[PDB]
Amino acid sequence: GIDPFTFENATSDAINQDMMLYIERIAKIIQKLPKRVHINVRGFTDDTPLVKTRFKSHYELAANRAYRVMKVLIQYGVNPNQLSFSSYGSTNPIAPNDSLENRMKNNRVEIFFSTDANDLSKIHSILDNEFNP
Amino acid sequence: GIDPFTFENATSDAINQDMMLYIERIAKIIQKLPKRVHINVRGFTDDTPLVKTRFKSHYELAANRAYRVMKVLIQYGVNPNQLSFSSYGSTNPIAPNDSLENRMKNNRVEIFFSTDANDLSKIHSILDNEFNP
């Protein structure tokens, strides 16, 4: 399956260089998709305390992450008309927050496609060509 | 009359220094509002034909105006977690699309507040404090 954008720094919204390149690939994929497909960039966090940062809440942290990924997709030519962003904060974890390994799973941004039934095949086919050799 | 933001020309998404000042004023207001109130930044166009611009459709234009305004609101300190943007293209004109003057009222971005009955008063006096005798 396709990978989400993982934030290794549990308390920041910083997009490093490896992640920028990956966002760029997804951007290239997105612009090839039919125009009636929209993209919702969703933001998540673990439950690491936020005390020594600027963020008041995990929602706020996840919003910044999703917004920033969205910003980057636009940088690489995705039309703002196909885009939106959402924050789920520390709700909806992939894994429980017991260990460092599982907490990384929770520090991510996920891409959601909004598509009809016919455009779903096209997305499927386009994603297959670019991601699986 | 708390006015929308009105763009300079039919096909432009440029935010002039005039509009910057006004968006900043709006950002100050938003930051005084209760945390449970959210802000949707709505973009519109007139129905001026789009040749000789980058934009392929009015929704792309309207989406770009609204995204830009939101990006500015954040720039001036508004929590991304309280923000979203929407494009309405040339739909929902506030005025008939005849004279240039009227077409321009349609080239605009509007701010919608999402609020419960109780936070509605808190928003009223905050807005009144800022835009009335």
Numbering used by the authors:
A (entry chain C), B (entry chain B): 119 to 251
Article excerpt on this structure:
The motility protein B (MotB) is a key component of the bacterial flagellar motor. It anchors the MotA/MotB stator ring of the motor to peptidoglycan (PG) of the cell wall and forms part of the proton-conducting channel that couples proton flow to generation of the turning force via an as yet unknown mechanism. The PG-binding site of MotB resides on the periplasmic C-terminal domain (MotB-C) which shows sequence similarity to outer membrane protein A (OmpA) and related PG-binding proteins. Although the PG-binding grooves formed by these loops are topologically very similar in different OmpA-like proteins, all five conserved residues (Gly161, Asp164, Leu179, Arg183, Arg226) that are thought to be essential for PG recognition are buried and inaccessible.
The structure of previously unobserved crystal form (Form B) of recombinant H. pylori MotB-C was solved by a molecular replacement approach using AMORE. The asymmetric unit of the form B crystal contains 12 subunits. The overall fold of each monomer is very similar to the Form A structure. It contains a mixed four-stranded β-sheet, with three α-helices packing against one face of it, and the fourth forming an N-terminal extension of one of the β-strands. The three longer petal-like loops (β1α1 (residues 126–133), β2α2 (163–174) and β3β4 (207–225)) have been previously implicated in the PG binding by MotB and PG-associated lipoprotein (PAL). Structural analysis and calculations of the accessible side-chain surface area in Form A and Form B crystals of H. pylori MotB-C and in the crystal structure of the periplasmic domain of Salmonella MotB show that all five conserved residues are clustered on one side of the molecule and are completely shielded from the solvent by loops (β1α1), (β2α2) and (β3β4). The most significant differences are observed in the structures of loops β1α1, β2α2 and β3β4 at the PG binding site, with the following residues showing the largest displacements of Cα atoms: Glu126 (2.3 Å), Asn127 (2.4 Å) (loop β1α1), Val169 (2.8 Å), Lys170 (4.1 Å) (loop β2α2) and Asp216 (2.4 Å) (loop β3β4). Analysis of the distribution of the main-chain temperature factor averaged over the total of 12 monomers in the asymmetric units of the Form B crystals also highlights these three loops as the most variable regions in the structure. Structure superimposition shows that there are significant differences in conformations of many side chains and the orientation of the main-chain peptide groups in loops β1α1, β2α2 and β3β4. Thus, our crystallographic analysis suggests that the flexibility of the semi-conserved loop region β1α1, β2α2 and β3β4 is important for PG-binding activity of MotB.
